[PDB]
Inverse folding.
């Protein structure tokens, strides 16, 4: 079931609840040297998706690392590390507060799209004189 | 402490100077050199992790400025164009004051003429070809003279005077670091020393900005005596040169304030005790050289 | 700036007398220091 | 005599200034001509690509 | 009949990506080269 | 043009051969060593016997003479340049 | 071509710029043999670049 409108600070638009990215490993490598068998990318992803789901459930109100610690753990240390990490990356606890505005209007508006000088791809505002017709066209 | 920032500085240097061509506009290179030396100016504390390479880099960076053409290799800069050549010596003082047994020591090894790093170092010195730090001396000898002593007054001096003293400071400091096979002497119809006339200028100013004047003149005198005696004793220890050196030393118009000036000095200001001692010992060495010459 | 007195950096140095008039200018600077100190 | 020497040095100065003006002029002309020669020889190389 | 549409949205995304290659090469502002001289504080700091 | 089927509008004129001849005459190489020249009409006989492409051969020859005249003026000009 | 590689801009047209509009038909070998002939004519009419 889905019952909320979830936004994220766009630059984060590299994260995918399905997969992992070179970003986080360079920020949390301690699950990837394959040295500590009790840790693995897999349990990492488990924790990850679990927590993000939790937050996305009722994101209007905050979510603590202590919460997850109560819920599931294999460690406090790494748990906190990654939790605060995602916090930084706003994937979690980002919409804890709401802010609004009346937004008065100005001459530029999103529904304004007219004919005017253009920086984009080519366009020809002057077509052809008379003698151009003088060609054995295709 | 932004170990990251320092790594950045280091490798950026290692590129900009050893630059296989990937940079488009030389002006970009100038920009890099320029804002780099500036941001250096705003540092007044430690540097030189994995030092030696970085130390040589910074030296080449400051040496970037000033017109080249033994003897002094640097035409003194006609001070109406540049302002970075300033920043150069500014840093070579500030970021070099730390007598901690690292930086000074790195340059001291630069007197000479993972582990592969060491291979690199000498690799560049012979790739800069004797000695080299004489070039640093010559560079330091720029922006001071030949314009203020050639002006119409001593007031417009004070501006660049404020700038001047750190230079002499740097110089005498590095002369603590020269006390082995060399050939060095740097008063050979190359600068003379208007330092005496300059000292006279600041003196007349005294009895007629501030807070820098007395130290400037003092260290100027100390510089004179120390470089003199060090040259003499050095080529004594080597003894590769005829005693003509004395005669040679005795043959400078820019030297040895006249004893009449000493006398008249000894009377009027009476506010320069330490400076009086400076000139005193100076004249002492002068008269000594005169005597023991014969 | 440096542009104003000279620009001689490299011109292919065809008929490289530029070194010579260079030296001339250098000795002019020499004479300049000379007269100043005189 | 020092005053005399200063006076005659000042006497000769403006001629030097004029010569410096001429220097600047001929230098700029040299510079333009250099540009032109570079252009032209590059044309000499293989006019297709240069064009 | 659809062609102009693809051309249009193409131009949209094209200008969009092109915008990324703009890093103020267009201009060359001053970068606060404040230190005309090093002030008194610099020298006295060196001595101190 | 030929690299541009879009050509300048015309009903009776002369454009390409015009500039062709301008550059040609400019060459002044009265003994221009190039594509076959004239010493006996048999040269033209064999040329026509060889001239069988629609225009491509002709075009190559044209641009060749173009480049030639350029090169000549270039040499002379750059000589004057070094002189200056 | 001239237009086929330029739009919303163009070389002016009062001089012999149509040389551009005839940009290439044998570029490499053409220009090569042209340089051959150029150096050849140089050496021929020739019989250091100063007097």
């Amino acid at each position: 079931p889905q019952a909320h409108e979830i936004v994220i600070p766009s630059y984060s638009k590299w994260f995918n609840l399905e997969k992992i990215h070179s970003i986080e490993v360079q920020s949390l490598p301690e699950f990837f040297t394959n040295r500590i068998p009790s840790k693995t990318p897999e349990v990492y992803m488990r924790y990850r998706n679990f927590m993000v789901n939790s937050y996305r459930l009722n994101p209007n109100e905050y979510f603590s690392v202590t919460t997850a610690r109560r819920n599931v753990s294999g460690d406090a240390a790494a748990l906190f590390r990654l939790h605060k990490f995602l916090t930084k990356w706003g994937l979690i606890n980002y919409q804890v507060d709401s802010k609004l505005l009346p937004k008065n209007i100005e001459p530029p508006l999103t529904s304004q799209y007219s004919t005017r000088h253009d920086a984009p791809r080519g366009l020809f505002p002057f077509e052809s004189y008379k003698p151009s017709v003088q060609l054995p066209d295709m | 402490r932004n170990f990251y920032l320092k790594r950045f500085i280091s490798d950026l240097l290692w590129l900009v100077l050893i630059h296989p061509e990937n940079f488009t506009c030389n002006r970009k290179i100038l920009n890099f050199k320029k804002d780099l030396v500036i941001v250096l100016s705003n540092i007044s504390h430690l540097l030189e992790i994995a030092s030696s390479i970085d130390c040589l880099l910074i030296l080449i960076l400051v040496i970037s400025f000033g017109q080249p053409k033994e003897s002094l290799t640097f035409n003194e800069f006609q001070l109406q164009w540049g302002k970075y050549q300033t920043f150069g010596v500014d840093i070579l003082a500030k970021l070099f004051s730390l007598e901690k047994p690292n930086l000074n020591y790195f340059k001291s090894i630069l007197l000479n003429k993972n582990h592969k790093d060491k291979k690199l170092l000498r690799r560049l010195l012979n790739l800069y070809n004797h000695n080299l730090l004489n070039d640093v001396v010559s560079f330091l000898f720029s922006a001071i003279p030949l314009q203020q002593v050639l002006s119409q007054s001593a007031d417009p001096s004070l501006l660049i005077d404020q700038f001047s003293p750190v230079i002499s400071q740097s110089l005498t400091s590095i002369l603590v670091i020269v006390q082995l096979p060399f050939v060095w002497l740097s008063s050979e119809e190359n600068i003379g020393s208007g330092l005496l006339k300059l000292s006279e200028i600041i003196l007349n100013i005294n009895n007629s900005y501030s807070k820098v004047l007395l130290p400037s003149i003092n260290i100027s005198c100390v510089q004179l005596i120390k470089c003199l005696v060090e040259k003499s004793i050095c080529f004594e220890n080597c003894l590769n040169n005829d005693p003509e050196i004395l005669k040679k030393i005795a043959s400078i118009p820019n030297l040895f304030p006249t004893d009449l000036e000493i006398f008249q000095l000894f009377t009027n200001p009476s506010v320069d005790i330490q400076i009086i001692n400076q000139y005193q010992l100076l004249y002492n060495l002068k008269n000594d050289i005169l005597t023991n010459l014969e | 700036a440096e542009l104003i007195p000279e620009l001689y950096s490299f011109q292919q140095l065809v008929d490289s007398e530029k070194r010579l008039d260079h030296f001339i200018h250098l000795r002019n600077l020499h004479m300049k220091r000379m007269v100043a100190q005189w | 005599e020092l005053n005399e020497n200063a006076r005659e040095l000042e006497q000769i100065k403006p001629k030097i200034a004029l010569q410096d003006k001429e220097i600047t002029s001929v230098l700029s002309n040299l510079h333009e001509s250099n540009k032109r020669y570079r252009f032209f020889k590059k044309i000499s190389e293989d006019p297709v690509k240069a064009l | 009949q659809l062609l102009p549409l693809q051309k249009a949205v193409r131009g949209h995304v094209l200008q969009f990506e092109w915008h990324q290659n703009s890093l103020l090469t267009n201009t060359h502002p001053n970068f606060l080269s404040k230190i005309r001289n090093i002030n008194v504080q610099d020298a006295l700091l060196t001595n101190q | 043009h030929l690299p541009f089927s879009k050509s300048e509008n015309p009903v009776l004129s002369t454009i390409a051969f015009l500039v062709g001849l301008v550059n040609p005459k400019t060459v002044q190489s009265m003994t221009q060593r190039a594509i076959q020249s004239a010493e006996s009409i048999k040269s033209q006989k064999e040329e026509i016997s060889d001239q069988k492409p629609i225009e491509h051969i002709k075009e190559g020859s044209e641009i060749a003479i173009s480049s030639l005249g350029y090169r000549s003026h270039i040499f002379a000009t750059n000589e004057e340049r070094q002189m200056n």
